[PDB]
Design a protein around this ligand. Structure first.
Ligand SMILES: [Fe+3]
Ligand SMILES: [Fe+3]
Lengths: 705, 706
């Protein structure tokens, strides 16, 4: 009774002799309603689609069939690829109804039926919680989730769309040499770690706990593709550089190591009140500075000192546990006070510990430059492995796996999360292949060498917790902020001109208001959150499987109210857009020689005095290592593009326009801040404007690099 | 009977035919007059003949006969028979029962067609005028008369005539009225030391200007970015090429002496508050003053009167400037502040700002730009005052008076002579191409065409003979106080001060050599006062060579041996020690104003966006640096060579050996100091060892030789 033309749009990219001629695709429409007489699903109705037109890398397939006028609203379309090669389906359009066309967004590779004979399903752009699902779609919605989970076994093939978890047992290459054997990260008290996508390749015969290496790493198919010589620029970079996440408030004094003195030597810092007051007493005493929150620190001592011994056995690198202390001065800019470098007892020698400060005599000033060199190598490694790799790439992949395993593609929270997870799993597979692997790029150019990835595991174990990954909680956790209802964004900042925090809190508020509007459209109260079985499964799986090694921690948010959900989703989206943008180049990634003042010989010391430039070049990365890191630095912006389903709900579309507008407003706010003579951490002679968090030239919406 | 004398003249390498065919007339002159008449004895000699040649040397030989009653030979006469001059090294007389007699010559002897007058050379024995052997008294006087000339005529290249004139030869008003320069010397407005008279025509355009020439006469025998680092900026005030400017801060707050009716408020903008922000973790400002921990390089009052006119020159600017330093507990200097001042001009108020090391980008860049201006000022002052004025320029009048008034036979002439070598010729070259209108200095230094005038201002306002000796200079600047129990009898407020520490070693060694030498010839005050040559010498220095200061009461008296030792030790220090320390890099000009001086919105924005571009626009151009560094690219040393008269006298020779040994000692002391980890102003990471005053090679020459 109803004639329907189905049009499929396919994108071109570069056994086929026996392709079924003129029957490339089988298309079947699915009714939204069960047969009201029996309660069972109606049979899908369909026909084959043949090639119809090619224009500029785009191919049309057409199918013509008849549907009874009581079939019901079409809520989904089933597709089978009859030919031997996969095809990329853009979208499907159903013409011929009196209600106008229906678009189905596909954006998917459809495997050859000879690789996978299961039919693919595409739902309309209308989104539903599970209990609100039209009765004709309930079982196919569930069956599709089952398909994406797979069954936990098998070597994953390129055409698979199977999402599941496995530990990091694929970074070493014991089959090439035992020297390339690396510990498994994940599944143990000593090496806790987020899980990654399961690949299922055979385990190695030389190292049984290792998964064999491969030149191709599976992801589910649709996931595939010297300024610091200036003390004031060294300091400003802690607030507006690429690693704005390390600086924290000094509360205790004197500074004291938490490590075991019986293994690590005296725990008390060598930074004294006398050293600091010689520098700042023209403004205030140390006691006043502590009370008035003017002392700030980047403290890598306790995390790095337990690795010093192992790392020092590696030719061409060294290590110290380090601290960098800063005074917040009268222009609200940071002044470097001191750098402390510590070697623990090793090789019959006691703990070695020295403090370096800015200096107006030549030797002290050269030791200061070398001290900054070591500290900057530590901060470069911490930035790359923790601020960047761990806290964006690594911890996010389990969220992506869980999203595809437990949230239907027609679930509203799936469609909110979806664009913020694009390209990450593939980038992460590339990182396991060539960045964080044994003798990969990090190990060969960074201070910790083969111990680098283990250090990210220690940072995960000791420090990572979901509830401080949102920007307010992170600032609060570091002593930079306290809650204050009057103050802008509800936060009083001890560092008021903190370009990363200032611009980030604008982005954070806009994202949160968008997530709030979006959640409130679909979840009207707590009972709708509590009764969402896909949502509950998703959050339970993230904690108990994706982050299994921390599943018993008490800091995991509950998921019982719309506000709980808003908090979880805002955190995830912030991480994939703003956090990642803020951590994406003069700094050394490795310091290859010890300080000249570390157990000097008479003639080693004299060589340093005679040619300290040579000592600096011996410490700095080789021009090859630097050329390695730099050359290794290899879509649309946040707020530019509507997802098909957002644009289909008029209220969701309106919320997105308000989001886009706030982002544009923030662009103008940031541009004005970069012109403000009072914001000396972003405006000043030679000071590059702070634009890392500026929308629209730009903030990406996902971790794509 | 009689004695057979073999006279041998050694000559260093005119047309060939005259060269080989003509020779010399050599005569010997008795030391004593005829004892029966008081009359001079006629000299005796004969014409020479070529005897030997080797290694660039020709030897002429004269053989003649002398009466046995002739007496001791006190001189030889030489008459060149070539029609070209000839350089005589030394003369030896053989055949006397007592042995050879050597006469040192070291003198060009003119062609007889230029000057037919015979040349006289005295033996190596030295005499005060009253001790001159009777046969030599007249010739000793006649020689001085010859060397003075008559004050007239254009001097020619074969002349041996020493006399004075003003610096009226630096401009070129025969090219442009813009190349006119004021006469330096002889007026209240432009006091200056005199220079050697050349006697060329005066300009018809500018009648007070001597006409320019490509050849300048001298008497014939006179002719031949580290500071980006604050720690090196401040260390160079003590161990760099201009260690002469730093002074103790005496008054607080700082205040100009210039008339406020013309130059604006005199109070410095450097305040207690600014300094206390930097040093309170060490001590209060009040205690830093009381404990002599605050030091300054203060060019404000000498430079401020030139600022208005220098700023009218395209491509440069000027401020009056001060740089303030704090001596910390490791006895290293921390720079505190730079003050830059513009006087009221163009109906605008005095502009005055202070710059300090800073904890934020804009203040840090402004500090670097202010360092750039002050360093250009320090460079100009070093070049024009510490170097040109205080060594070259004030010394030339001593050289003129020495030749006009001290006999070549006089012991003090023979003490001074090596320390005066090459200076007159170099100074001539400077008048020709360095301090002349549109010369190297005017073209590459901040003051432009006002550069030489500023050296005249420094001479008129600051130069005094009695503070040119090193102890007096350090006491004058507040660096030292007299203290019997301290080394050299001076307690230094900057104890690690490489120039001063090393310089005081040199000073004492020179002073005891001069003391030994003077005491050999002047046994009491009566011998100093009755020395008519020495008195005329000192009178000519004060009333002619330094005529514009003739009335100052700080001129040393010259009545006692100790007066003479003071005077000569000062002169020798200046020609050797002082010159070595400032001669053997920084910008010489800063071409644009500080960005913070009357900024416009767009000018300020440009500076913020590209400060490195602003630095380059301020710094010297590549040509200006080339001219300087190419010119700045251009003999034996102190304690190395005995003068002939010094070797001739056993006690003086012994005194020189002690002098030489002390200098060798001082070398080892200085090498030890450059390895002392406690002496952070000369030893440290990347610190070049301080060797400018190290005897026996950067080398202490005995004279201002370059
Ligand atoms: Fe990344
Ligand atoms: Fe010189």
């Amino acid at each position: 009774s109803v004639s329907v033309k189905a049009t499929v749009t396919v994108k071109l990219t570069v056994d086929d002799v026996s392709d079924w001629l003129g029957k490339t695709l089988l298309l079947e429409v699915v009714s939204s309603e069960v047969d009201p007489k029996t309660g069972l699903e109606k049979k899908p109705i369909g026909a084959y689609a043949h090639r119809a037109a090619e224009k500029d890398g785009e191919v049309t397939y057409e199918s013509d069939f008849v549907i009874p006028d009581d079939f019901g609203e079409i809520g989904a379309v089933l597709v089978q690829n009859e030919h031997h090669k996969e095809m990329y389906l853009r979208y499907i359009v159903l013409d011929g109804f009196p209600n106008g066309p229906i678009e189905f967004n596909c954006s998917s590779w459809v495997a050859s039926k000879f690789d996978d004979p299961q039919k693919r399903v595409f739902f309309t752009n209308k989104s539903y919680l599970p209990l609100e699902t039209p009765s004709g779609l309930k079982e196919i919605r569930e069956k599709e989730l089952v398909t994406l989970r797979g069954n936990g076994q098998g070597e994953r093939k390129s055409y698979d769309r199977i999402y599941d978890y496995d530990v990091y047992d694929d970074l070493g290459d014991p089959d090439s040499s035992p020297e390339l054997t690396r510990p498994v990260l994940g599944g143990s008290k000593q090496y806790p770690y987020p899980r990654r996508c399961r690949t299922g390749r055979p385990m190695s015969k030389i190292d049984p706990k290792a998964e064999t290496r491969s030149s191709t790493v599976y992801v589910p198919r649709d996931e595939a593709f010297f300024s610091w010589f200036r003390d004031e620029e060294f300091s400003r970079q802690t607030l507006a550089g690429l690693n704005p996440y390390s600086i924290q408030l000094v509360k205790e004094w004197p500074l004291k190591s938490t490590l075991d003195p019986k293994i690590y030597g005296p725990p008390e810092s060598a930074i004294t009140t006398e050293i600091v007051e010689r520098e700042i007493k023209g403004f205030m005493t140390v006691d006043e500075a502590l009370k008035q929150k003017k002392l700030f620190i980047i403290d890598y001592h306790d995390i790095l000192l337990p690795y010093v011994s192992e790392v020092r056995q590696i030719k061409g690198t060294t290590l110290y546990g380090s601290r960098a202390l800063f005074f917040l001065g009268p222009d609200n800019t940071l002044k470097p006070l001191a750098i402390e470098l510590v070697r623990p007892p090793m090789d019959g020698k006691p703990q070695w510990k020295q403090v370096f400060t800015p200096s107006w005599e030549a030797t002290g000033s050269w030791l200061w430059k070398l001290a900054k060199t070591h500290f900057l190598a530590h901060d470069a490694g911490y930035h790359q492995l923790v601020s960047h790799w761990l806290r964006t790439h690594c911890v996010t992949e389990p969220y992506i796996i869980a999203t595809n395993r437990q949230l239907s593609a027609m679930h509203p929270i799936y469609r909110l999360l979806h664009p913020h997870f694009r390209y990450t799993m593939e980038i992460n597979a590339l990182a396991r292949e060539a960045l964080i692997n044994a003798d990969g790029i990090i190990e060969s150019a960074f201070t910790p060498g083969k111990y680098s990835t283990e250090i990210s595991s220690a940072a995960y174990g000791l420090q990572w917790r979901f509830d401080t990954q949102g920007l307010p909680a992170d600032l609060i956790s570091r002593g930079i902020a306290v809650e204050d209802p009057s103050s802008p964004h509800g936060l009083k900042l001890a560092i008021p001109d903190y370009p990363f925090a200032n611009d980030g809190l604008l982005l954070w508020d806009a994202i949160k208001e968008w997530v709030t509007d979006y959640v409130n459209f679909f979840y009207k109260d707590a009972s709708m959150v509590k009764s969402d079985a896909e949502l509950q499964a998703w959050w339970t799986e993230i904690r108990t499987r994706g982050h299994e090694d921390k599943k018993d921690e008490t800091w995991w948010p509950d998921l019982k109210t719309p506000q709980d959900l808003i908090g979880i989703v805002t955190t995830m989206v912030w991480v994939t857009s703003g956090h990642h943008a803020a951590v994406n180049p003069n700094r050394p990634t490795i310091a290859r020689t010890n300080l000249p003042s570390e157990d000097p010989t008479e003639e080693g010391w004299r060589r340093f005095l005679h040619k300290p430039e040579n000592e600096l070049l011996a410490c700095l990365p080789t021009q090859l290592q630097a050329a390695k890191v730099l050359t290794v630095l290899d879509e649309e912006y946040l707020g530019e593009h509507l997802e098909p389903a957002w644009g289909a709900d008029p209220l969701i579309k309106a919320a997105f326009e308000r989001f886009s507008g706030r982002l544009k407003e923030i662009e103008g706010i940031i541009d004005a801040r970069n012109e403000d003579k009072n914001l000396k951490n972003r405006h000043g002679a030679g000071v590059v404007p702070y634009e890392l968090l500026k929308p629209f030239s730009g903030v990406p919406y996902s971790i794509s690099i």
